[PDB]
Design a protein around this ligand. Structure first.
Ligand code: MG
Ligand code: MG
Ligand code: MG
Ligand code: ZN
Lengths: 159, 44, 176, 132, 337, 138
RNA sequence: GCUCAGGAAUAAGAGCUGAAUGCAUCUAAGCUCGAACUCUGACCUAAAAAGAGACCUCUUUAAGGAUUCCGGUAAAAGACC
RNA sequence: GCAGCUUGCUACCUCGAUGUCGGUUCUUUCCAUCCUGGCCGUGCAGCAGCGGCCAAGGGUGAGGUUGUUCGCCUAUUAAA
RNA sequence: AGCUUGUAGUCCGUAAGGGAGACAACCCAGCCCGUGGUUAAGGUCCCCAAGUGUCGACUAAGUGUUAAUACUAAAGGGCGUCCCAAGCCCCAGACAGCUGGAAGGUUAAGCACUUCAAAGAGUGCAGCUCACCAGUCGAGGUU
C-alpha cells in the first residue's frame, strides 16, 4: 500500500480512539536521538515540510532510521541531538463487497502536518553542521512531501 | 603485454555510475547523464 | 576587478589575415587557411597585425563564444605561421602491422591478423609520415591535424575484446 | 552443411516412418524433426536426401526402441536431378543412424545409397557398399 | 493472443498490379558507361526454351568444369534500325526533350506504327543539336530504335516496335558523334552484347486474366472442416473492426500477369546466325522455326513466346568478366515428344 | 516576384498569403530552396520527417518533397484554399527552385520583416536542405 | 531461372577543435565517424501533376481512329495485341 | 510515477439485442526488443555469459494433453 | 472515479446572440422588429476584422503557442541559463595553469623531531603522485 493512497489531506481528523476499534500502532520507536542531555548545541537546524500532507508512521520511522544512522556515522553517537517533533495521531482506515458499508477498518496511524511545520529538529556542533544537514536531506527523501532545511540557531555561526 | 600510451588512451578514463558512459579523467560529472559520481575504468 | 569580455589576438609578422565577408582567412609562410567564423552579436575586427573579437552583450553564451572565437583565431594564426605537429605510436602485441601512406588515406595491414587492411583518411593538406614505430602528423590546420590523428586512432579500435589484454592499435602520445 | 551438387526435393516430412537400413538394430524410425531447418507457418518439417533428422525408433530391438536418435536419409522415392540433367529415383526410402557430425552408428548399409550423401558424409559413402 | 507469425502473402513491391500500359517494356534507368561508345539496349522476340549441355565455367561453383544441362531461352534478334537521335536538357524539374533528328532513309514498314518522317532537316537538325550540345543545354543523348519483325515467320506482326536506347559513352560530345555514326543504320545484336556477358531482360509477362487471391497472392486455402463450408479459395478476413475500411494490402482478386518485369543477371550463352542450329524437329511449339540470327539466354525470361524482350547490359551485375562459354550440345530434339 | 533567398518560411508565407488575399497579383517566389527555417537542425528534420511519413497511402497527407512545392504547401496552409477565394489565390501563386528562364532579368521585391538576419541565433536550416533530406531532387 | 550493393545524412556511442572556468573538458557554437532504421540507388506504377507537361512527325474535309472481316502474345463484358 | 495489456470499483452509453470464449484465415499497429544490426560497463583472457543504451526493417515456426486463454511437455531453431 | 451522498449561491433542464476549434450548464449576455453608433467577453502574423504594436527582461527546449475545467504528469536532480542576498580568500598579489622540494623522519614492515617560510605515522600507477611554502602572468575566485 503506497503512501500516495493515504497522503492528501481532504478529510477531517480521525483521532478519537475511544470511538473506534483496534488501531495497529505506529512502527516508530523513538522520538529523541543522540545526546538527550546536552542542551548546549550552538548550531541547530530543522527539517520543515512545505505542503499539507499526512505522513504515515512507517514513513516517519524510515526517515528517522536513515537520519539517525547517517548522524551516528557522521558525528558519532553522542555528537548530535535529533528530535522528531510530530507524533502520528491520525488513524488511517482502508475499505478492505464493493462500496456498500464503505467505512473501513483502521490500517495504521499517521501525522497530519501543515506547511512550514518542522518535522525534525537537529542540534549539532559547528563542525558537524554539514553532516547533520546532509542527513536531514536523506531523511526528507523518505517523506511524501517536498522538504526544505531551515537553520534554528547559529545562523551567523555558519555564514 | 600492456603498453603505456595504450592504457593512457584506453584505461585512463572515468565511467558514469548510472549510464556507464565514458567521461574524461578530470571530469567530476558525466557529460551524457549528468550524474555526480564517476568511477575510474577497471584495469585488473 | 572590472571585466573585459573583448579579446585581442596579435597577428605575428609574416602573417596577413583579413575578414572578407564572415569568413576569416590567415595567410603566411607555412601556408594559408580560410575559415568561417560567424556568430550573431560577435564582431571581429582585423587591424595592424592584431584582431579583436568583442560581443555586444555580456551574457555567458557571449563570453563562451568570444573565448572560442579568440582561441580559433590564435590557432589559425599559429598554424599559418608555424603549423602543428602531432605524434602517435604504433605498438602491437603479436601481429606486426604494415603501416603506409598511399595517397590521402593511411594503410593498416594485418591488424590483429585481419586480411583486409584498415583505411584511415587524411584531412586537409596534412603530411603523415610513418617513421618506423611511430607516426608523425603535420599540418597548417589544428582541426585537420587533430582529426587526422583521430581518424588514425579510431580506425584501430578493437571492437569486441577486453582492452586490458588486447591493446594493439595506434595511439596519440602528443596532441596538436 | 556443405552444398551438394544436385537439387534434392524435401520429400519426407515429420511423422514419416522410414525403413532404417543399417545394422544398428532399429528397423523403422519416424521423423520427428530436421536439423538445420527453420520452418514457416503450418509447414511440416521436410527432409530430402542428405538431411540429418531427429527420429524416434518405432520398430527394432528392445534397446533401440523408443529412443530419439540422429539419422541421415540415404534414399528417397521422390526423384531428384543430377547436375547433368538426369533425374534419379529409388525404389524405396531409407535412412541410416548417425551422430551429429555424420558418422554412422552401424557398420554396413544394406542396399544402395545416393551418391550425394556419400559426397557430403564420406563415412556414409565408405560404409555403404553400392552407391547410386 | 499468442500470435502465430507468417510473412505477408505476396509482394506489395509490385502494386498496383494492373495491366501494363504497353506491349513494349520500358527502362526507367540506364547503367553508367564504362568504356567505348555503344548502344545500351537491344530488342528481340522470345521464341522458346531448350537446354544445352555446356561445360561449367562459373568460378567457385561446386560443379565447375563438369558437364551441366542449363535451360536456355532462344531469342530471335534481327538487326534494328537506329531511327532518331534525341537530346535531353537537364534542369531543376527534370530531363526534357530538347530536339530530335530522324534518319533520312527508313524502312517502308514503319508506316503501320507511325507516319514516315520526311528526309528533310538531316544536316540542319544535326547542326542544331551540335550547337545545343556546345552551349551546354544538352545533358544526354539517346537513340530511338525499332525492331523489323517483317522477316520473322513465328511472330505474326510486321509493324516495328519503337523504343529509346541510351548510348553508353563517356563525353556527351563522344556520345553525339557515335550517335551520328550509327544514326539511320542497322546494328546487329553482336554490336551491343558480347558472348558470355550478363544482361537485363524486361518484357510484359504472361497475362493470366483476372485471377483469384489464392493464385494472385498465394494465400491459404481453407483447411479441414473449413474446406467445405462455403469459402475455399476466399481470403478469410478483409479487415478488423477498426479501421473501418479494407486496406490496399489485403490479398484480393484482380489482373494477374501481363505486368512489366525486369530480370537481372540473365547470362548470354550463344550468338547464332542460323535458325537451324537451335530449331528442334517439328519446329518450336506454336512458333515455327528460327530464320534470323538469335541469342541463347541462360534460364527463363518473362513473357510467353513471340513477346518483345528488351535487353540491356546489367545494372546491378555483381560478378566480373565471365568469358566465352563452351557449349557441347544444343538440344534440338523435339519439344512435342 | 518575390526573391525568397534568406527569408523566414512562415513570415514569407504569411506575407504572400495576405498579398494574394488582397486579390490581384500573380506572385512568383524564386529561390525557394534558399528559404530559412529557425530552430535547431535536429528538431527541424525530426518534425519534417514525421510530417513526411505521416498519412495513409490511399487517403493520407501526401506531403511534398520539393522545396518549391513545400513553400507552396506552407502558403496553402495560410489560405482559405477550399473556398473560391483560396482557390483563386493558389492558382495565382507560382513557386520555383532557382530562377526559371522566363524570370531572368525580371524585377524582384523581398519582404523586409521576413528577413533572416532579424533572427539572433545560428539555429536555422534552409528549406532546400530539408527538401534534400526528405529525398527530393531539385 | 533471377533475387547485390555503393553513396549521403543520422540515433545510442566513440572522438577532434574549443571556451564558459587562464588549465582540463566529445558541447555551449563548430567538425569527423557511427546502425538490419531514414534518404539516394534498384524495381513496379506514374500527364486527372488544376503549375493538368517536353520534343519530333503527319495533315486540315485530310492525317488518323473505330466497326465489318481472319485471328491470339490478350481476354469476365469492355479493353489489349 | 507511467501503461490500461489482470482482477476490482462505478453505473455515464446500449435491454423495439452492438451475436457472447477459444481456435482458424488475413491485414495492420506500439516498443516496455526474444533473435537479427550498432554500442557501453564488467567481478569482459578467448569461447560463453551478465547488466544497460539505440533500433520496430525482417523473423518469431512444427508438435502431445486440455474447449481453452494461460501453463506444462517434446524435438528443432538465430529466436522460437 | 465524468463515483456516491449533502449544504450555500448561480446555472442547464426551460437560455437566444457574441467568444473559447467543436463545448447542455465556462466568460460577456439574459433576447420584441429594422437602421446607425460604441463597447462587453476575447482577440489583432495568415486561415480571420483589427498590431509582423511599444517599453524592460526571460526561454533555445518547437518547451510553449491549453483562464475554469471530467480536456493539463510527479518525486528527485541540473558547474542549462538569468537574478537577489550573505559568509570566506582578495592588486601587503587569491582562484585556475607554469618552475626547485614533499630532503629530519619510521621498517611505529607508510597503500590487509630542539627547530627551518618549504617533509605525514601518508592522496597515488621502492623510485613513479596530491595536500602544502617560494616565484610567476595580474584579477576576481569559492561556499
Ligand atoms: Mg455558473
Ligand atoms: Mg434559467
Ligand atoms: Mg452559447
Ligand atoms: Zn553518466
Amino acid at each position: 500500500k503506497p503512501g500516495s493512497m493515504y497522503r492528501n489531506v481532504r478529510q477531517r481528523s480521525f483521532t478519537r480512539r475511544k470511538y473506534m476499534g483496534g488501531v495497529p500502532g505506529s512502527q516508530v520507536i523513538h522520538y529523541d536521538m543522540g545526546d538527550k542531555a546536552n542542551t548546549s548545541f550552538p548550531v541547530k537546524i530543522s527539517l520543515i515540510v512545505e505542503e499539507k500532507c499526512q505522513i504515515r508512521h512507517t514513513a516517519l520511522e524510515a526517515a528517522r532510521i536513515t537520519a539517525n544512522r547517517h548522524l551516528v556515522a557522521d558525528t558519532g553517537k553522542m555528537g548530535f541531538y535529533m528530535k522528531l517533533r510530530v507524533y502520528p495521531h491520525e488513524v488511517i482506515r482502508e475499505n478492505k463487497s464493493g462500496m456498500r458499508r464503505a467505512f473501513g477498518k483502521n490500517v495504521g496511524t499517521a501525522a497530519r502536518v501543515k506547511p512550514m511545520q518542522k518535522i525534525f529538529t537537529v542540534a549539532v556542533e559547528k563542525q558537524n553542521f554539514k553532516a547533520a544537514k546532509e542527513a536531514l536531506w536523506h531523511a526528507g527523501q523518505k517523506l511524501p512531501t517536498p522538504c526544505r532545511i531551515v537553520v534554528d540557531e547559529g545562523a551567523e555561526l555558519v555564514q | 603485454a600492456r603498453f603505456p600510451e595504450a592504457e593512457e588512451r584506453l584505461l585512463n578514463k572515468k565511467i558514469c555510475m548510472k549510464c556507464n558512459a565514458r567521461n574524461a579523467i578530470r571530469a567530476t560529472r558525466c557529460r551524457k547523464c549528468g550524474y555526480g559520481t564517476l568511477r575510474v575504468k577497471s584495469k585488473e | 576587478m572590472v571585466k573585459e569580455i573583448a579579446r585581442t589576438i596579435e597577428i605575428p609578422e609574416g602573417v596577413s589575415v583579413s575578414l572578407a565577408q564572415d569568413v576569416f582567412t590567415a595567410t603566411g609562410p607555412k601556408g594559408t587557411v580560410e575559415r568561417k567564423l560567424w556568430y550573431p552579436g560577435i564582431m571581429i575586427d582585423v587591424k595592424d597585425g592584431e584582431v579583436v573579437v568583442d560581443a555586444e552583450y555580456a551574457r555567458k553564451e557571449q563570453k563562451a563564444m568570444v573565448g572560442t572565437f579568440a582561441s580559433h583565431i590564435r590557432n589559425l594564426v599559429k598554424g599559418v605561421n608555424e603549423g602543428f605537429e602531432c605524434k602517435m605510436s604504433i605498438v602491437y602485441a603479436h601481429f606486426p602491422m604494415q603501416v603506409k601512406v598511399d595517397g590521402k588515406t593511411l594503410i593498416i595491414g594485418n591488424f590483429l591478423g585481419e586480411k583486409k587492411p584498415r583505411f584511415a583518411k587524411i584531412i586537409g593538406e596534412t603530411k603523415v609520415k610513418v617513421s618506423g614505430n611511430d607516426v608523425t602528423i603535420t599540418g597548417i590546420n589544428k582541426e585537420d591535424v587533430g582529426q587526422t590523428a583521430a581518424n588514425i586512432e579510431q580506425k584501430t579500435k578493437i571492437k569486441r575484446f577486453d582492452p586490458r589484454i588486447f591493446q594493439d592499435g595506434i595511439y596519440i602520445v602528443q596532441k596538436a | 552443411m556443405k552444398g551438394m551438387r544436385s537439387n534434392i526435393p524435401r520429400a519426407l516430412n515429420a511423422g514419416a516412418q522410414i525403413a532404417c537400413v543399417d545394422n544398428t538394430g532399429a528397423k523403422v524410425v519416424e521423423i520427428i524433426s530436421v536439423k538445420k531447418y527453420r520452418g514457416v507457418k503450418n509447414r511440416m518439417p521436410c527432409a530430402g536426401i542428405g538431411d540429418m533428422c531427429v527420429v524416434s525408433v518405432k520398430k527394432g530391438t528392445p534397446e533401440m526402441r523408443k529412443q530419439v536418435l540422429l539419422a541421415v536419409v540415404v534414399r528417397q522415392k521422390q526423384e531428384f536431378r543430377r547436375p547433368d540433367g538426369l533425374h534419379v529415383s529409388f525404389e524405396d526410402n531409407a535412412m541410416v543412424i548417425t551422430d551429429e557430425e555424420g558418422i554412422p552408428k552401424g557398420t554396413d548399409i544394406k542396399g544402395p545409397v545416393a551418391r550425394e550423401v556419400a559426397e557430403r558424409f564420406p563415412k556414409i559413402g565408405t560404409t555403404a557398399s553400392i552407391i547410386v | 493472443m499468442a500470435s502465430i507469425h507468417r510473412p505477408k502473402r505476396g509482394s506489395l513491391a509490385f502494386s498496383p498490379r494492373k495491366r501494363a500500359k504497353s506491349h513494349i517494356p520500358r527502362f526507367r534507368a540506364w547503367p553508367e558507361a564504362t568504356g567505348e561508345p555503344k548502344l545500351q539496349s537491344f530488342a528481340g522476340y522470345k521464341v522458346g526454351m531448350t537446354h544445352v549441355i555446356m561445360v561449367d565455367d562459373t568460378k567457385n561453383s561446386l560443379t565447375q568444369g563438369m558437364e551441366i544441362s542449363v535451360p536456355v531461352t532462344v531469342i530471335e534478334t534481327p538487326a534494328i534500325r537506329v531511327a532518331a537521335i534525341r537530346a535531353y536538357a537537364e534542369d531543376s524539374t527534370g530531363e526534357k526533350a530538347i530536339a530530335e533528328v530522324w534518319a533520312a532513309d527508313l524502312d517502308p514498314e514503319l508506316k503501320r506504327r507511325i507516319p514516315i518522317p520526311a528526309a528533310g532537316n538531316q544536316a540542319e537538325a544535326l547542326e542544331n543539336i551540335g550547337k545545343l550540345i556546345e552551349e551546354g543545354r544538352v545533358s544526354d543523348v539517346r537513340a530511338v530504335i525499332y525492331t523489323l519483325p517483317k522477316s520473322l515467320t513465328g511472330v505474326p506482326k510486321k509493324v516495328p516496335d519503337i523504343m529509346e536506347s541510351g548510348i553508353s559513352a563517356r563525353d556527351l560530345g563522344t556520345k553525339f558523334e557515335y550517335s551520328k555514326t550509327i544514326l539511320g543504320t542497322l546494328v546487329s545484336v553482336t554490336d551491343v552484347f558480347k558472348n558470355g556477358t550478363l544482361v537485363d531482360t524486361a518484357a510484359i509477362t504472361i497475362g493470366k486474366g483476372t485471377q483469384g487471391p489464392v493464385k494472385r497472392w498465394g494465400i491459404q486455402l481453407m483447411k479441414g472442416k473449413h474446406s467445405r463450408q462455403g469459402s475455399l479459395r476466399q481470403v478469410g478476413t478483409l479487415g478488423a473492426f477498426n479501421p473501418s475500411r479494407v486496406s490496399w494490402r489485403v490479398p484480393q482478386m484482380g489482373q494477374m500477369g501481363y505486368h512489366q518485369r525486369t530480370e537481372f543477371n540473365k547470362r548470354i550463352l550463344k550468338i547464332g546466325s542460323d535458325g537451324e542450329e537451335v530449331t528442334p524437329e517439328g519446329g518450336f511449339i506454336n512458333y515455327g522455326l528460327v530464320r534470323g540470327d538469335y541469342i541463347l539466354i541462360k534460364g527463363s525470361v518473362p513473357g510467353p513466346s513471340k513477346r518483345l524482350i528488351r535487353l540491356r547490359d546489367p545494372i546491378r551485375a555483381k560478378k566480373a568478366d565471365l568469358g566465352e562459354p563452351n557449349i557441347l550440345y544444343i538440344s534440338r530434339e523435339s519439344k512435342q515428344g | 516576384v518575390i526573391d525568397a533567398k534568406g527569408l523566414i518560411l512562415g513570415r514569407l508565407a504569411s506575407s504572400v498569403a495576405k498579398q494574394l488575399l488582397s486579390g490581384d497579383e500573380k506572385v512568383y517566389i524564386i529561390n525557394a530552396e534558399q528559404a530559412i527555417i529557425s530552430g535547431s537542425r535536429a528538431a527541424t528534420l525530426r518534425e519534417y520527417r514525421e510530417t513526411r511519413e505521416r498519412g495513409a497511402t490511399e487517403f493520407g497527407p501526401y506531403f511534398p518533397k520539393r522545396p518549391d512545392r513545400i513553400l507552396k504547401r506552407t502558403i496553402r496552409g495560410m489560405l482559405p484554399y477550399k473556398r473560391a477565394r483560396g482557390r483563386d489565390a493558389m492558382s495565382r501563386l507560382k513557386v520555383y527552385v532557382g530562377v526559371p528562364y522566363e524570370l531572368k532579368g525580371a524585377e524582384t521585391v523581398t519582404i523586409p520583416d521576413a528577413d533572416m538576419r532579424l533572427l539572433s541565433s545560428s539555429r536555422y536550416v534552409e528549406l532546400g536542405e530539408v527538401s534534400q533530406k526528405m529525398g527530393s531532387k531539385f
